[PDB]
Write an enzyme that holds these catalytic residues in place. Structure first.
Site, PDB file in Angstrom:
ATOM      1  N   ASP A 168       0.857  -1.180   0.000  1.00 21.80           N
ATOM      2  CA  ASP A 168       0.000   0.000   0.000  1.00 21.80           C
ATOM      3  C   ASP A 168       0.904   1.244   0.000  1.00 21.80           C
ATOM      4  OD1 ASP A 168      -2.211   1.641   0.106  1.00 21.80           O
ATOM      5  OD2 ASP A 168      -2.823   1.071   2.146  1.00 21.80           O
ATOM      6  N   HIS A 305     -10.133  -2.447  -7.241  1.00 20.81           N
ATOM      7  CA  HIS A 305      -9.981  -1.365  -6.266  1.00 20.81           C
ATOM      8  C   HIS A 305      -9.293  -0.110  -6.810  1.00 20.81           C
ATOM      9  CE1 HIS A 305      -9.803   0.518  -2.326  1.00 20.81           C
ATOM     10  NE2 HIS A 305      -8.489   0.659  -2.447  1.00 20.81           N
TER      11      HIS A 305
HETATM   12  C1  HEM Z   1      -9.070  -1.567   4.534  1.00 26.68           C
HETATM   13  C2  HEM Z   1      -9.458  -0.874   3.448  1.00 26.68           C
HETATM   14  C3  HEM Z   1      -8.480  -0.604   2.281  1.00 26.68           C
HETATM   15  C4  HEM Z   1      -7.419  -1.326   1.886  1.00 26.68           C
HETATM   16  C5  HEM Z   1      -6.916  -2.652   2.503  1.00 26.68           C
HETATM   17  C6  HEM Z   1      -6.818  -0.652   0.746  1.00 26.68           C
HETATM   18  C7  HEM Z   1      -5.696  -1.060   0.049  1.00 26.68           C
HETATM   19  C8  HEM Z   1      -5.139  -0.430  -1.039  1.00 26.68           C
HETATM   20  C9  HEM Z   1      -4.046  -0.935  -1.829  1.00 26.68           C
HETATM   21  C10 HEM Z   1      -3.366  -2.284  -1.550  1.00 26.68           C
HETATM   22  C11 HEM Z   1      -3.805  -0.059  -2.809  1.00 26.68           C
HETATM   23  C12 HEM Z   1      -2.750  -0.176  -3.929  1.00 26.68           C
HETATM   24  C13 HEM Z   1      -1.470   0.601  -3.596  1.00 26.68           C
HETATM   25  C14 HEM Z   1      -1.482   2.000  -4.157  1.00 26.68           C
HETATM   26  O1  HEM Z   1      -1.864   2.156  -5.342  1.00 26.68           O
HETATM   27  O2  HEM Z   1      -1.097   2.921  -3.434  1.00 26.68           O
HETATM   28  C15 HEM Z   1      -4.743   1.033  -2.662  1.00 26.68           C
HETATM   29  C16 HEM Z   1      -4.812   2.155  -3.441  1.00 26.68           C
HETATM   30  C17 HEM Z   1      -5.705   3.187  -3.322  1.00 26.68           C
HETATM   31  N1  HEM Z   1      -6.810   3.238  -2.466  1.00 26.68           N
HETATM   32 FE1  HEM Z   1      -7.255   1.779  -1.088  1.00 26.68          FE
HETATM   33  N2  HEM Z   1      -7.579   0.486   0.467  1.00 26.68           N
HETATM   34  C18 HEM Z   1      -8.586   0.552   1.406  1.00 26.68           C
HETATM   35  C19 HEM Z   1      -9.543   1.538   1.461  1.00 26.68           C
HETATM   36  C20 HEM Z   1      -9.663   2.614   0.610  1.00 26.68           C
HETATM   37  C21 HEM Z   1     -10.756   3.561   0.599  1.00 26.68           C
HETATM   38  C22 HEM Z   1     -11.932   3.523   1.600  1.00 26.68           C
HETATM   39  C23 HEM Z   1     -10.513   4.456  -0.380  1.00 26.68           C
HETATM   40  C24 HEM Z   1     -11.355   5.679  -0.787  1.00 26.68           C
HETATM   41  C25 HEM Z   1     -12.704   5.642  -0.755  1.00 26.68           C
HETATM   42  C26 HEM Z   1      -9.263   4.107  -1.005  1.00 26.68           C
HETATM   43  C27 HEM Z   1      -8.659   4.794  -2.024  1.00 26.68           C
HETATM   44  C28 HEM Z   1      -7.506   4.425  -2.659  1.00 26.68           C
HETATM   45  C29 HEM Z   1      -6.830   5.223  -3.649  1.00 26.68           C
HETATM   46  C30 HEM Z   1      -7.184   6.621  -4.174  1.00 26.68           C
HETATM   47  C31 HEM Z   1      -5.655   4.413  -4.084  1.00 26.68           C
HETATM   48  C32 HEM Z   1      -4.639   4.854  -5.147  1.00 26.68           C
HETATM   49  C33 HEM Z   1      -5.244   4.546  -6.520  1.00 26.68           C
HETATM   50  C34 HEM Z   1      -4.376   5.040  -7.640  1.00 26.68           C
HETATM   51  O3  HEM Z   1      -3.919   6.207  -7.604  1.00 26.68           O
HETATM   52  O4  HEM Z   1      -4.132   4.253  -8.582  1.00 26.68           O
HETATM   53  N3  HEM Z   1      -8.795   2.957  -0.420  1.00 26.68           N
HETATM   54  N4  HEM Z   1      -5.522   0.781  -1.560  1.00 26.68           N
END
Ligand code: HEM
Ligand SMILES: *[C@@H]1O[C@H](CO)[C@@H](O)[C@H](O)[C@H]1NC(C)=O
Length: 439
Positions: A168, A305
């Protein structure tokens, strides 16, 4: 514009990136005494972006930032409208809109008793505890701590990974107005996407709100044995490269749900097998935009996601408006072999989620409601994308396209991420803390 890095709370722009973090949620008992303590506390302890980009030899042993809820500002006689649609009512009042099962929320988040949060970041528990005790000592009876949530990076080679096992903190927007490194595929946006009162912010802000930001805080409990069991029970049988063992098919299904392998390798670039070296390389691990997979799901499902929360070319080109910074940290113990074997969670673990933006409704809340929860987003696709499997909240939680060789097959995914509470905070500039909040 030249951003005053010494005046911006560091977690907003740079991110603490510490191994341990504690969120001390408080209520103000005595506004006058709180303000008096604040004027001595801020210059000594509140960590700027400038300190965070300095050499480690020039940094304190722990970093502290501070945000206020609407009721905290009201309790302090700070009455000017900040211009945000969601901030005034607080997150509990918005939780149903987000799709939350309200029965899983817990005190003290179930109302607007929380006035603010101190966030303390440090690379070990001792220093974290000392700086936490320093807050208690400095503020004394002027506050009551209503909750403390503590997180920690996962151990060993899992450092930087969240509890499902995925790296992450790869993809963050970069704002103009300061000198920094921009990676291939990284979004570059005006600073007002993140910082209130700066170019790109269209909200109506009091002058004193310049260089603040809104935090969406979410306390998520994660169901890791359940996630793992689901991937094994629904393991993808084959992809373009050939047949998969069950273990390979389960790993692949997890990567299809996220849009990245656990290593961080994005599936748009590595669509059939992990590439751990790619995942670890920031020069390459963000250099994609879905332009190679706008109208099919072989390379990446429409509803993965990362694709739901940052649609890139699914929007038709670069768009500044819906980017946000994240500074989340896992919490809780590792998942034991026995827990994984049973397929049933036995311990409390999850993510203390932190997302910053100038307009709550355009960042966190847009990503959640308009995108993740929206079965028909991204728009104009040949197969219904469905509900984002990780944090989409609409029921039934049905997502299409996870099997690249049978894209019309739908998966109904149990919810593995449980919101336990959250709040919307405003983090003022450092000068605003003393010149406005504590005046
Ligand atoms: C326990 C809950 C969550 C987990 C385990 C999780 C995990 C992750 C992981 C593994 C990544 C990929 C690494 C990265 O691109 O930085 C990611 C990206 C991202 N997540 Fe989540 N996430 C969670 C909740 C959320 C929520 C609630 C939101 C917004 C509503 C969110 C928004 C984002 C965004 C904006 C990215 C970057 C996407 C991009 O720029 O390509 N995440 N998250
Ligand atoms: C691929 O799997 C199918 C069963 O789904 C099997 O019939 C076939 O023999 C396998 N092919 C190879 C090359 O192993």
């Amino acid at each position: 514009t030249i951003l005053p890095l010494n005046n911006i709370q560091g977690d907003i722009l740079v991110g603490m990136k510490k191994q341990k973090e504690r969120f001390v949620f408080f209520q103000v008992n005595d506004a006058t005494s709180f303000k008096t303590a604040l004027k001595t506390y801020v210059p000594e302890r509140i960590t700027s972006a400038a300190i965070l980009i300095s050499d480690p030899s020039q940094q304190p042993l722990a970093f502290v930032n501070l945000g206020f809820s609407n009721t905290g500002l009201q309790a302090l006689g700070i009455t000017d409208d900040l211009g945000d649609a969601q901030f005034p009512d607080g997150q509990f009042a918005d939780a149903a809109n987000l799709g939350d099962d309200l029965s899983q929320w817990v005190a003290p988040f179930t109302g607007t008793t929380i006035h603010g949060v101190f966030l303390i970041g440090s690379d070990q528990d001792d220093f974290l505890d000392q700086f936490t005790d320093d807050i208690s000592s400095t503020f004394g009876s002027s506050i009551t701590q209503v909750q403390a949530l503590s997180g920690s990076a996962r151990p060993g080679d899992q450092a930087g990974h969240e509890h499902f096992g995925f790296l992450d903190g790869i993809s963050q927007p970069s704002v103009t107005g300061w000198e920094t490194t921009v990676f291939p595929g990284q979004a570059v946006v005006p600073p007002g996407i993140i910082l209130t009162g700066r170019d790109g912010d269209t909200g109506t802000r009091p002058s004193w709100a310049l260089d603040g930001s809104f935090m969406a805080f979410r306390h998520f409990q994660q169901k890791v044995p359940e996630f793992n069991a689901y991937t094994l029970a629904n393991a993808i049988p084959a992809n373009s490269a050939g047949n998969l063992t069950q273990q390979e098919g389960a790993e692949f299904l997890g990567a299809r749900m996220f849009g990245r392998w656990k290593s961080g390798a994005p599936i748009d670039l590595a669509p059939t097998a992990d590439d751990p070296a790619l995942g670890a390389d920031p020069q390459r691990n963000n250099n994609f935009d879905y332009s190679d997979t706008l109208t099919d799901e072989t390379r990446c499902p429409f509803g993965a996601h990362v694709r739901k929360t940052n649609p890139r070319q699914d929007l038709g080109g670069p768009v500044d408006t819906f980017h946000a910074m994240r500074s989340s940290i896992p919490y809780g113990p590792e998942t034991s072999d026995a827990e994984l074997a049973s397929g049933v969670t036995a311990q409390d673990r999850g993510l203390l989620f932190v997302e910053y933006q100038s307009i709550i409704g355009n960042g966190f809340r847009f990503q959640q409601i308009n995108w993740a929860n929206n079965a028909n987003f991204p728009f104009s696709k040949p197969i219904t994308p469905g509900i984002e499997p990780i944090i989409g909240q609409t029921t039934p939680r049905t997502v299409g396209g996870l099997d690249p060789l049978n894209q019309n097959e739908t998966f109904t995914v149990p919810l593995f991420v449980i919101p336990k509470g959250g709040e919307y905070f405003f983090l003022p500039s450092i000068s605003a803390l003393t010149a406005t909040i504590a005046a």
